[PDB]
Amino acid sequence: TIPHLAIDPFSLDFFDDPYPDQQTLRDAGPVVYLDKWNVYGVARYAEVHAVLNDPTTFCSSRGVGLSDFKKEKPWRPPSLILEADPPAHTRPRAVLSKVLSPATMKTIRDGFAAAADAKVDELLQRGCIDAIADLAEAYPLSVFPDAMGLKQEGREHLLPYAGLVFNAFGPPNELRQTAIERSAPHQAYVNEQCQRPNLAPGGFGACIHAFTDTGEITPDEAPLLVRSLLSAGLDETVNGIGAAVYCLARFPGELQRLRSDPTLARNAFEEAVRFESPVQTFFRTTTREVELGGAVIGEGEKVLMFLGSANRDPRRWSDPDLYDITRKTSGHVGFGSGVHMCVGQLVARLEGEVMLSALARKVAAIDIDGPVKRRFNNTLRGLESLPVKLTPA
Numbered sequence: 001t002i003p004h005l006a007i008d009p010f011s012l013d014f015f016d017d018p019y020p021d022q023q024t025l026r027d028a029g030p031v032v033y034l035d036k037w038n039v040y041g042v043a044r045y046a047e048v049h050a051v052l053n054d055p056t057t058f059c060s061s062r063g064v065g066l067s068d069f070k071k072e073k074p075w076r077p078p079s080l081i082l083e084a085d086p087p088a089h090t091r092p093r094a095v096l097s098k099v100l101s102p103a104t105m106k107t108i109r110d111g112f113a114a115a116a117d118a119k120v121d122e123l124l125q126r127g128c129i130d131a132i133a134d135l136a137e138a139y140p141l142s143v144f145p146d147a148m149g150l151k152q153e154g155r156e157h158l159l160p161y162a163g164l165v166f167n168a169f170g171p172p173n174e175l176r177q178t179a180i181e182r183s184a185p186h187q188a189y190v191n192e193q194c195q196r197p198n199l200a201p202g203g204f205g206a207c208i209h210a211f212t213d214t215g216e217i218t219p220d221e222a223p224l225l226v227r228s229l230l231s232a233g234l235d236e237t238v239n240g241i242g243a244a245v246y247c248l249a250r251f252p253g254e255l256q257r258l259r260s261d262p263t264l265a266r267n268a269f270e271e272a273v274r275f276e277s278p279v280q281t282f283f284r285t286t287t288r289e290v291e292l293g294g295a296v297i298g299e300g301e302k303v304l305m306f307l308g309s310a311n312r313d314p315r316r317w318s319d320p321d322l323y324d325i326t327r328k329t330s331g332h333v334g335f336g337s338g339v340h341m342c343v344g345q346l347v348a349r350l351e352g353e354v355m356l357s358a359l360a361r362k363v364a365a366i367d368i369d370g371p372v373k374r375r376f377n378n379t380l381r382g383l384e385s386l387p388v389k390l391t392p393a
């Protein structure tokens with residue numbers, strides 16, 4: 001009753017161009033079985049949204065990667081928030097929700113916006129740049145570690161650790177195993193910076209520790225929660241900003257609309273998150289035998305969700321493959337949906353918005369002028385290099 005497919009969603013062939021295969025996964029049925037990895041898969045918007053919003057049936061405490069924590073040991077201690085279900089998930093979630101709250105965004109917006117303006121003016125003096133290394137990567141690295149309260153020493157481990165985290169969600173292919181095997185130096189750096197004395201007072205990490213006073217988390221829980229913000233938020237935001245620049249170069253009419261109304265910057269970034277879906281895939285594990293679509297999934301089975309596919313499903317989106325900066329983007333699952341929906345979404349949107357605002361006000365054209373290279377990762381989509389020429393407005 002359930003179609004079996006041999007598509008490998010963790011192959012380089014898939015990463016290079018997943019969209020034809022995503023249609024095949026969508027059109028094969030509401031639920032598919034991926035024989036290559038012995039997991040179920042859902043690729044349409046309806047089922048992805050349904051799974052995300054049914055946490056008691058499709059749980060996260062057995063891991064949101066391929067590996068099942070009931071069967072295998074986690075490569076690192078499980079995340080206190082991402083790999084927890086209610087009620088264990090709730091109070092750590094509340095802490096990060098307050099640390100990364102709307103109120104918090106007021107304290108960082110001016111600095112984040114000023115840095116984005118300055119970065120774009122710096123790049124305009126160069127003309128031709130790499131929009132990944134010199135922009136999409138450079139800008140978040142220039143604001144987020146400082147906002148986190150990290151010391152200067154050791155920040156060279158941040159990008160390697162982020163890449164490792166998202167590769168480890170995947171199957172035990174080469175990308176995953178090569179990342180985990182010699183990852184101890186990255187883990188030692190991260191674990192050290194999660195300790196209270198190493199975090200600048202007033203930053204995100206120190207604020208997490210400050211919540212131990214309230215009874216929401218214990219002191220021994222706090223380092224693990226800080227770790228979440230050195231795991232998530234970097235590569236996804238980098239990839240999202242890079243995709244936004246790519247779309248503004250490939251859809252030049254949309255850059256001209258953004259220039260004419262820079263207040264579209266926030267939605268222009270949201271549309272890029274839907275278009276790119278920097279977090280392409282992750283898993284749930286069934287706690288019960290379940291009827292999804294017309295399929296009966298057994299208990300203890302891994303269920304792979306295709307967020308990028310859900311955000312390009314023509315059953316839900318008009319012209320899903322077009323980048324449209326005035327599209328009504330509410331309802332996309334690029335940030336997830338339900339109880340786990342990205343707790344850092346306000347930080348990501350802030351970085352994306354102010355960068356696209358700086359582009360909107362300062363740049364007249366963005367032209368690709370060199371070979372474009374893709375960045376390969378088991379669960380992230382994004383570019384490795386994006387040579388562009390920036391024309392000043």
Ligand code: HEM
Pocket residue numbers: 060064081082083093096100228229232233234236237240273277278279282333334335336337339340341342343344345347348
């Ligand atoms: C464009 C940027 C981003 C994208 C596409 C993204 C994507 C996601 C997604 C899809 C989830 C849901 C995971 C699940 O349901 O299992 C999630 C959760 C999460 N995100 Fe993000 N994220 C982004 C930025 C950030 C930032 C900037 C931070 C931190 C500053 C962050 C921290 C987290 C954390 C801690 C969770 C776990 C939340 C929970 O389980 O309750 N993310 N993110």
Ligand SMILES: CCSc1ccc(C(=O)O)cc1
Pocket residue numbers: 064079080081082083165227228229231232279282
């Ligand atoms: C799968 C969504 S991206 C993400 C990665 C790691 C964490 C964490 O370490 O808590 C949270 C979210």
Ligand SMILES: [Cl-]
Pocket residue numbers: 076186187188190191
């Ligand atoms: Cl670690």
Ligand SMILES: [Mg+2]
Pocket residue numbers: 110111114
């Ligand atoms: Mg300033």
